[PDB]
Design a protein around this motif. Sequence first.
Motif, PDB file in Angstrom:
ATOM      1  N   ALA A 165       1.013  -1.173   0.028  1.00 25.33           N
ATOM      2  CA  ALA A 165       0.022   0.085  -0.141  1.00 25.33           C
ATOM      3  C   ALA A 165       0.853   1.312   0.000  1.00 25.33           C
ATOM      4  CB  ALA A 165      -0.773  -0.080   1.211  1.00 25.33           C
ATOM      5  N   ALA A 166       1.863   1.236   0.777  1.00 27.46           N
ATOM      6  CA  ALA A 166       2.779   2.422   0.866  1.00 27.46           C
ATOM      7  C   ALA A 166       3.162   2.455  -0.430  1.00 27.46           C
ATOM      8  CB  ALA A 166       3.842   2.035   1.844  1.00 27.46           C
ATOM      9  N   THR A 167       3.912   1.511  -1.221  1.00 27.54           N
ATOM     10  CA  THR A 167       4.411   1.748  -2.197  1.00 27.54           C
ATOM     11  C   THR A 167       3.517   2.170  -3.493  1.00 27.54           C
ATOM     12  OG1 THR A 167       6.201   0.138  -1.869  1.00 27.54           O
ATOM     13  CG2 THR A 167       5.944   0.495  -4.148  1.00 27.54           C
ATOM     14  N   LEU A 168       2.239   1.448  -3.603  1.00 31.27           N
ATOM     15  CA  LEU A 168       1.285   2.148  -4.574  1.00 31.27           C
ATOM     16  C   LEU A 168       1.076   3.469  -4.518  1.00 31.27           C
ATOM     17  CD1 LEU A 168      -1.286  -1.021  -4.195  1.00 31.27           C
ATOM     18  CD2 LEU A 168       0.258  -0.365  -6.248  1.00 31.27           C
ATOM     19  N   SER A 169       1.162   4.040  -3.604  1.00 30.35           N
ATOM     20  CA  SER A 169       0.444   5.633  -3.310  1.00 30.35           C
ATOM     21  C   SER A 169       1.783   6.285  -3.348  1.00 30.35           C
ATOM     22  CB  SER A 169      -0.233   5.557  -1.903  1.00 30.35           C
ATOM     23  OG  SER A 169      -1.120   4.744  -1.915  1.00 30.35           O
ATOM     24  N   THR A 170       2.975   5.660  -3.274  1.00 32.31           N
ATOM     25  CA  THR A 170       4.029   6.686  -3.445  1.00 32.31           C
ATOM     26  C   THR A 170       5.038   6.586  -4.337  1.00 32.31           C
ATOM     27  OG1 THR A 170       5.321   5.546  -1.681  1.00 32.31           O
ATOM     28  CG2 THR A 170       3.979   7.007  -0.865  1.00 32.31           C
ATOM     29  N   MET A 171       4.772   5.616  -5.114  1.00 33.73           N
ATOM     30  CA  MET A 171       5.834   5.218  -6.498  1.00 33.73           C
ATOM     31  C   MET A 171       5.771   6.150  -7.663  1.00 33.73           C
ATOM     32  SD  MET A 171       4.207   1.660  -7.981  1.00 33.73           S
ATOM     33  CE  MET A 171       2.392   1.544  -8.641  1.00 33.73           C
ATOM     34  N   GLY A 172       4.585   7.020  -7.750  1.00 31.78           N
ATOM     35  CA  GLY A 172       4.349   7.877  -8.791  1.00 31.78           C
ATOM     36  C   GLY A 172       3.846   7.181  -9.993  1.00 31.78           C
ATOM     37  N   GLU A 173       3.976   7.951 -11.260  1.00 34.60           N
ATOM     38  CA  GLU A 173       3.574   7.251 -12.359  1.00 34.60           C
ATOM     39  C   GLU A 173       4.404   5.962 -12.703  1.00 34.60           C
ATOM     40  OE1 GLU A 173       2.496   8.905 -16.214  1.00 34.60           O
ATOM     41  OE2 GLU A 173       1.372  10.595 -14.994  1.00 34.60           O
ATOM     42  N   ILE A 174       4.082   4.910 -12.893  1.00 32.41           N
ATOM     43  CA  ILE A 174       4.740   3.782 -13.744  1.00 32.41           C
ATOM     44  C   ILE A 174       4.227   3.656 -15.066  1.00 32.41           C
ATOM     45  CG2 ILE A 174       5.364   2.758 -11.417  1.00 32.41           C
ATOM     46  CD1 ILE A 174       3.038   0.864 -12.145  1.00 32.41           C
ATOM     47  N   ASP A 175       5.176   2.929 -15.979  1.00 33.02           N
ATOM     48  CA  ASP A 175       4.991   2.752 -17.296  1.00 33.02           C
ATOM     49  C   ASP A 175       4.842   1.021 -17.191  1.00 33.02           C
ATOM     50  OD1 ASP A 175       4.257   2.489 -19.961  1.00 33.02           O
ATOM     51  OD2 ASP A 175       6.338   3.414 -20.479  1.00 33.02           O
ATOM     52  N   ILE A 176       3.601   0.444 -17.455  1.00 31.07           N
ATOM     53  CA  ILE A 176       3.836  -1.094 -17.616  1.00 31.07           C
ATOM     54  C   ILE A 176       3.625  -1.275 -19.149  1.00 31.07           C
ATOM     55  CG2 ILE A 176       2.632  -3.368 -16.936  1.00 31.07           C
ATOM     56  CD1 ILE A 176       1.455  -1.948 -14.458  1.00 31.07           C
TER      57      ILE A 176
END
Length: 355
Positions: A314-325
């Motif tokens: 949860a911490a990572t989802l909310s703070t990783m910013g934009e990801i490009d999959i």
Amino acid sequence: AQIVLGQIGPFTGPLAADAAGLNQGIKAYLAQANKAGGIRGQKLTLFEADDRFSGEGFAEQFPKAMEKKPLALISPMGSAAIKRMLDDKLLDTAPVVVVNGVPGAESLRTPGHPKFFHVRAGDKQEIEEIVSHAQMLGMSKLATLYQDLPTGTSGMAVVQEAVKTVPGGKIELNGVKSGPDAAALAAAARQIAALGAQGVLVIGPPPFIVAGIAALRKADVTQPLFVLSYVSAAQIVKVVGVAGARGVGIVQAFPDPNDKMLPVQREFQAAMKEAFPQMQEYTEFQLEGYLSARTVGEALKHPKNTGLSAANLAATLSTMGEIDIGGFHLDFSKGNAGSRYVNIGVIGRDGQVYY
């Protein structure tokens, strides 16, 4: 040790095929992820539980799922199920994150829950896009066929608000509610046929969309029909043929599962060949399951992530910013809705979807 993920889904009942599709996509990603060494020294495993397309079934399965200490529940499916999850406040003290939810009804997303993350664009944005598209087709009168369900009513309210605020001008809107049975749909279709609408939106769970299209075509509604991200063109052609399917617009929340334009399309297809080699053609639900699972994978592998708990995720989802999959972007920086991707495909005279 292993990374546990759970999927609670309507594996028996009227959504059995679509739940199986989500499940196939999730497994396809997990197998790909495990072939690549899992995450942080640990294999990914999936357990499954059948909610039987009911809120009661979901309520029953949730604590059993939580006993397995999953990091995430992946893409629960079913209006009643998600509504029950939110009404019973099951997420308030459960150490878990829920990644994606089907359908993307506005009533399930707003206010939603801070542990509930959405990978697909919401019904609201899809409906706004449909109404914009209808105007570009020169339409001034739209009908909506919707199932008498809370998420259907939510959809209908969204359509009404979208139509009264579309920037091209006034569209007259009629909305026809229907029960899910064949007799109810035939009557609803006869009503719609009498309206002189230029296009018809169909809103409801996947089997209702298919049944509604067939009922409309049988009532000689030859006008363009528009549907949200809940059916494949293949399912429509199976029932009404290329003849009935042509002219149906499908709002897509993801790149086409059968095209090869983006890296993520090719990676998904590669994962599907490996896991399910007999399969000749893919669906949007398979791709949704793959992307929902891959979102968890990419968060757990992200340089910012420091562990393998639900709290870490949860911490990572909310703070990783934009990801490009692989060309599909997600960002939970501003809230729990990670995607604004919406793309309308139309089934052509050749039975293929064009964008």
